[PDB]
């Protein structure tokens, strides 16, 4: 899931 890197990221 890459929507959920996306909160990592942030």
């Known amino acids: 899931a ?3 890197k ?3 990221l942030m």
């Open 2 to 4: 890459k929507f959920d």
């Open 6 to 8: 996306f909160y990592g």
